[PDB]
Amino acid sequence: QRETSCSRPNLDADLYGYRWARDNVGQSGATIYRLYGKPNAPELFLKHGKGSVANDVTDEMVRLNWLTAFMPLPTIKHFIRTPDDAWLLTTAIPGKTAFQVLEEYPDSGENIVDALAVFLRRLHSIPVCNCPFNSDRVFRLAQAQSRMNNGLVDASDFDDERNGWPVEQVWKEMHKLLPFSPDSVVTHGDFSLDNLIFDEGKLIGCIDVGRVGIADRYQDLAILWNCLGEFSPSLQKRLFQKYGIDNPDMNKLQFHLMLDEFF
Numbered sequence: 001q002r003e004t005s006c007s008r009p010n011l012d013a014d015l016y017g018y019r020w021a022r023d024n025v026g027q028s029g030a031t032i033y034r035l036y037g038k039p040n041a042p043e044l045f046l047k048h049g050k051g052s053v054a055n056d057v058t059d060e061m062v063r064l065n066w067l068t069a070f071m072p073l074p075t076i077k078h079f080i081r082t083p084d085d086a087w088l089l090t091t092a093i094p095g096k097t098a099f100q101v102l103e104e105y106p107d108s109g110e111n112i113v114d115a116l117a118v119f120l121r122r123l124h125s126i127p128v129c130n131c132p133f134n135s136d137r138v139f140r141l142a143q144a145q146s147r148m149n150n151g152l153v154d155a156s157d158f159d160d161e162r163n164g165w166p167v168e169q170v171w172k173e174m175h176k177l178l179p180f181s182p183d184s185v186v187t188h189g190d191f192s193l194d195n196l197i198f199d200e201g202k203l204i205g206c207i208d209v210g211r212v213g214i215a216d217r218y219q220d221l222a223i224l225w226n227c228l229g230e231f232s233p234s235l236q237k238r239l240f241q242k243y244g245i246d247n248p249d250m251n252k253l254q255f256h257l258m259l260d261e262f263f
C-alpha cells in the first residue's frame with residue numbers, strides 16, 4: 001500500500017529573549033552557549049558541533065535521552081541534526097560543579113567525596129540489561145587508536161607521570177597492563193569533578209554524558225580518583241572506602257588513566 005494522499009505538517013522561538021554567553025571557552029569539542037537572563041524562564045545550555053564533533057553531540061543527545069529514565073540529568077528541549085551540524089539545547093542543572101564547591105569549601109571535602117561515591121554506586125547499580133550502549137575497553141581502545149592515528153591526541157595534557165612521553169609510548173605501555181578481569185556496569189565515561197553538579201549543599205545531577213555505556217567500573221573510579229589527586233591523597237582513598245572497595249586495583253586504575261590520555 002502507498003496511500004499517496006498529499007498531507008503536510010523550530011529552534012528560533014525557543015530562544016526568544018535570552019542573553020547569550022559563550023562558556024567553557026578554552027576547552028575542546030562543541031561550542032557551548034549559556035542562555036540566561038530571560039525573565040520567567042529557566043537557564044539553558046546550547047551545544048553546537050560541526051563535522052566530526054556533530055557525531056559527539058549526537059552521541060550525547062541519545063545518552064541523555066536514555067539515561068534520564070534512571071538518573072538526574074539535563075532535559076532535552078530541542079535537538080537538530082543536519083549533514084554537517086548538530087545542535088543540542090538542554091535545561092541547565094542549577095548550581096556549581098564538584099570542583100567549584102571543593103575550592104569554595106575546602107572543609108567540605110569529605111562530605112563531597114562521600115556524596116560522589118554514593119552517586120556513583122547508584123549509577124553503577126542500573127542493571128546492564130537496560131543499557132543499549134557499549135563503552136567497553138575494546139571499543140574505547142579502538143577509538144583511542146583512531147584518535148592517535150588521526151593526530152588528535154593532546155600530548156601536552158598527559159598526567160604528570162607521563163609528562164613528555166610520546167603518544168606512541170603511552171599506547172605501547174598501556175597494552176602491557178592487559179588483560180584483566182571482565183567487569184561490566186553502566187558507566188558515565190567522564191566522571192570528573194567538572195561533570196557533577198552541587199546545589200544548596202546537595203549533589204543534584206551529572207552532565208556531559210556522551211560517553212555513557214557499559215564498561216568497567218574503574219572507567220569512572222579512575223577518572224574521579226585522578227581529579228581528587230589535585231587536592232589530597234586522603235580524599236582519593238576515601239573515594240574507594242565509601243564506594244566499598246577494600247583494595248583498589250592499581251592495574252585497572254592505571255589502565256583507565258592511561259586510556260583517558262587519548263581523549
Ligand SMILES: NC[C@H]1O[C@H](O[C@H]2[C@H](O)[C@@H](O[C@H]3O[C@H](CO)[C@@H](O)[C@H](N)[C@H]3O)[C@H](N)C[C@@H]2N)[C@H](O)[C@@H](O)[C@@H]1O
Binds near residue numbers: 028227228229
Ligand atoms: N581533551 C579533552 C578532555 O580534556 C580533559 O580530560 C583530560 C584530563 O583533564 C587530563 O588530566 C589533567 O586534568 C585533571 C583534571 O581534569 C587533573 O586531575 C590531572 N592531574 C591533569 O593531568 C588527563 N591527563 C587527560 C584527559 N583527556 C577533560 O576532563 C575532558 O572532559 C576532555 O574531554
Ligand SMILES: Cc1ccc(-c2nn(C(C)(C)C)c3ncnc(N)c23)cc1
Binds near residue numbers: 023045090091092
Ligand atoms: C560553572 C558551570 C556550571 C555548569 C555547566 C554546565 N555545562 N553544561 C554542558 C557543558 C553539559 C552543556 C551543563 N549542562 C547542564 N547544566 C549545567 N549546569 C551545565 C558548566 C559550567
Ligand code: NA
Binds near residue numbers: 067068070071072073
Ligand atoms: Na532524569
